[PDB]
Structure 1
């Protein structure tokens, strides 16, 4: 798991890996020159007793006031302490890891004027699997994610706390595990740490990875449902999608053709396989899942760029000798990317729920009502369908956009903000909702196919069936339903179906 980072070149697949599992990283040697050059430029500005806002200038009245080196050193600590004003649930370690790596990535490009040694400290925490406490809420994604990044930065100073092996350690305990001792920040370093969009970006990246996972599961589940109700393959005909010209849809049908094949034992099992027209939940899968693929591709485009962005402030341009203040802390693009992903995740679940609904209806599924025999006496999947409906509906309200709101802070200087952290975070729960729907679709279609005694579907959809049946049995007589849904959900969360989808379809896969 050893990543040698060339700053600014992380790929979405690399980000997914960093999000998914611990990492051992090292900065590429070629990053050192620009990083050290940046610090040298700050050191010269101060050595020449020059005044540079964000570098050695104070605040408010002192904003046009050079600062005594002792006080400059002190100002750093005070900024981090006061800015660590976040609240709510701790982030989990995988997400904290991602955030730390994005900050390392950005700092290591050499425009922030921070000492290499502080970057090395963050790298050491990551390699040691020591994860600073970071509370979920507080950032508005403008100037940066000041509070969550400040909470992160506390551990560096020997403040706050960090998790190691699932247990909270004091910063000193935690630093020691990393082979570190508390740091003392210099000019510009507090700002270099607290400014930026890494929390916002990390929140949205997890939303993306979830959206991708659910896309991949939905193609396999949708394939099984088609098979379970003896659906047609004609909706996936390449000529249909070429004639439309929508690329998400073209690629989506291609995926369906890949998992389903030209036919199967089960589909060959009935004289007529298309005779009657299929419902839209089946027949329009390429169009709807195609619209979702494009959506998440559009988001991923924006987020993969932001993961490599230089997002602090002000920026140090050592090549010019320049220090400049811009607005890259404003995470507006991130906020809209998260609101875009919301549409994708919601509609993936909505279509799956209608496929479940379809399999529940005797007049449409060519299956026993509620997917069970002895129907007078058994309810079978009846309430599972209800749970799917509850989950799906939830996503309509959750899809309301956060990127359209803003409140001015600090006497109207921060007078427009992105609300990107909120946008990204709601995607995690929408993904839980859509994950439960798909898990119930999975259960339904596999039950259904079982009822077409001994008949098999395609090679990849048989693997999908086998993966489920490894944990949950055919539903005979009524039994406690919930645990089956729990197991299906966990399987999906573990990416059990992801490997079935053709590679290079999804942005980070």
Structure 2
């Protein structure tokens, strides 16, 4: 995707796109005035020998002292090098790309006083698919990971190109660049910000959305497999409750399931008995999850466009002002919010899987297999989904409620947003595994309703799975089937069945 960026206008769908695939971008011409005017403001402050904290000062001792030009420029390098104190596994290229593009976006709104040539250097890196090494951990919400990113601009650190590490000099050259020397305020402009926190949480959101869409299809397949009712999805019920997420959710189920199917019709009377809550309360539970992820997405969509460095430059007035927009508290709470939705999607699916194993509730053979006296069928796959569901409870513990003082008590409250966002990725693997197993069981259960078909989109879901995994006729090595189902989910195999305009970025 080619992108002419109007800074501060990225949509959640564009962000998903940046996250999913390489991008080519350039700044809209309308961005230049504010970018160049905040640089001219910094330039005028220096020209006039005025002192301004975080523009031409030192820190602490010198926080009110106009440093000489010479140490001022050395100070920028010294900040990046000293702040690149992150540790842990390298981020994958997708996430690095996302962080570069959010930083470009934020800087390009023109409140940061950073030269357009430096923004364009980062854009050249993105366009060249050259991605700085950024370690996963260290930020308390994003000095360290942003410093690592910034190292390459200076000819330090290292960067990935076509899946291999290159020296920074080598990587710059790939992008048509040479090492840059930073000017006043540019160290802080690059290092202060919330882009890593935001990127981590956006990834969590996109995964949550992916999982939501898959769960509507899987949940529909399970309803059908156990001869459940469509009545709990009646629009009147959801309208009477009033919750928008549940209303939109029920509408999605109706779209996928339709009014009836050959399976539903062939069991003429399927009401005479009530469906368990893991089926019948899908609109209420999945709806709550949808609301939760929409709340998170509203906050993260705003933050992807935020001016998050410090101090900020207000060239129209001539003012430079020290604030706290680098504090990623709203991102950390958004991430903790997504944790509850990813957890509960998985919880509800696991109880559906357990329903399908139980001969007294499924109207299917025990554990979905013929001749169970000597075949175990799906028994231990349900165990695995139980393990994955359970792990999500502890993982749900919020990180936004913790803080430790830093910078000898000057930076005395912090957000822990990076940790909040990154735990979502594993929570999503857990839930993805649970749904993979649910997908496999419901298709197996429907297969046992010999020759009968479910609805048009749900047959698409059965066919997607059966292209890779066969019916379970008798015990065989189980895990490869789960691996295959998970990979299908990871690739978005079921996402397209969900109606449009339901999920924030879809």
TM category, shorter: over 0.9
**Number of residue-to-residue matches in the alignment:** 506
Residue 309, structure 1, aligned to residue 306, structure 2: yes
SS of equivalent to 2:355: helix
**Cα offset for 1:68?**
1.5
CA distance in 1, matches of 2:96, 2:29: 25
Cα-to-partner distance string for 1:50-106 (whole Å, 9 max, x where unaligned) = 101000001221112111212111000000000000000100000000000000000
Cα-to-partner distance string for 1:15-50 (whole Å, 9 max, x where unaligned) = 000001000011101100100011000000000011
Select the residue among 156, 169, 172 that pairs with 2:166: 169
CA distance in 2, matches of 1:453, 1:181: 67
CA distance in 2, matches of 1:463, 1:275: 29
**Cα offset for 1:275?**
1.6
Cα-to-partner distance string for 1:235-282 (whole Å, 9 max, x where unaligned) = 000011011001000000000000000000011111312221000000
CA distance in 2, matches of 1:443, 1:492: 12
Residue in 2 aligned with 1:79?
79
SS of equivalent to 2:57: coil
RMSD: 0.6
Cα-to-partner distance string for 1:417-440 (whole Å, 9 max, x where unaligned) = 000000000000000000000000
CA distance in 1, matches of 2:271, 2:439: 22
CA distance in 1, matches of 2:255, 2:413: 47
CA distance in 1, matches of 2:479, 2:252: 31
**Cα offset for 1:202?**
0.4
**Cα offset for 1:111?**
0.3
**Cα offset for 1:377?**
1.3
Cα-to-partner distance string for 1:419-470 (whole Å, 9 max, x where unaligned) = 0000000000000000000000000000110110111100000000111111
Cα-to-partner distance string for 1:178-215 (whole Å, 9 max, x where unaligned) = 11110000000000000010000000000000000000
Residue in 1 aligned with 2:88?
88
CA distance in 2, matches of 1:2, 1:274: 53
Select the residue among 197, 201, 210 that pairs with 1:200: 197
Moved over 3 A (4+): none
CA distance in 1, matches of 2:158, 2:70: 26
**Cα offset for 1:296?**
0.2
**Cα offset for 1:394?**
0.3
Residue in 2 aligned with 1:462?
459
SS of equivalent to 1:89: strand
CA distance in 2, matches of 1:349, 1:364: 20
SS of equivalent to 1:487: helix
CA distance in 2, matches of 1:33, 1:413: 35
**Cα offset for 1:410?**
1.2
TM-score by length of 1: 0.99
**Cα offset for 1:163?**
0.4
Higher alpha-carbon deviation: 333-342 or 264-273: 264-273
Cα-to-partner distance string for 1:293-342 (whole Å, 9 max, x where unaligned) = 00000000000000000000000000001100010010000000000000
Residue in 1 aligned with 2:49?
49
Residue in 2 aligned with 1:322?
319
CA distance in 2, matches of 1:270, 1:66: 83
CA distance in 2, matches of 1:360, 1:422: 36
Residue in 2 aligned with 1:18?
18
**Cα offset for 1:477?**
1.2
Residue in 1 aligned with 2:388?
391
CA distance in 1, matches of 2:147, 2:163: 21
SS of equivalent to 2:179: coil
SS of equivalent to 2:177: coil
Higher alpha-carbon deviation: 335-344 or 58-67: 58-67
SS of equivalent to 1:184: coil
SS of equivalent to 2:105: helix
Higher alpha-carbon deviation: 149-158 or 53-62: 53-62
Residue in 2 aligned with 1:29?
29
Gaps of 5+ in 2: none
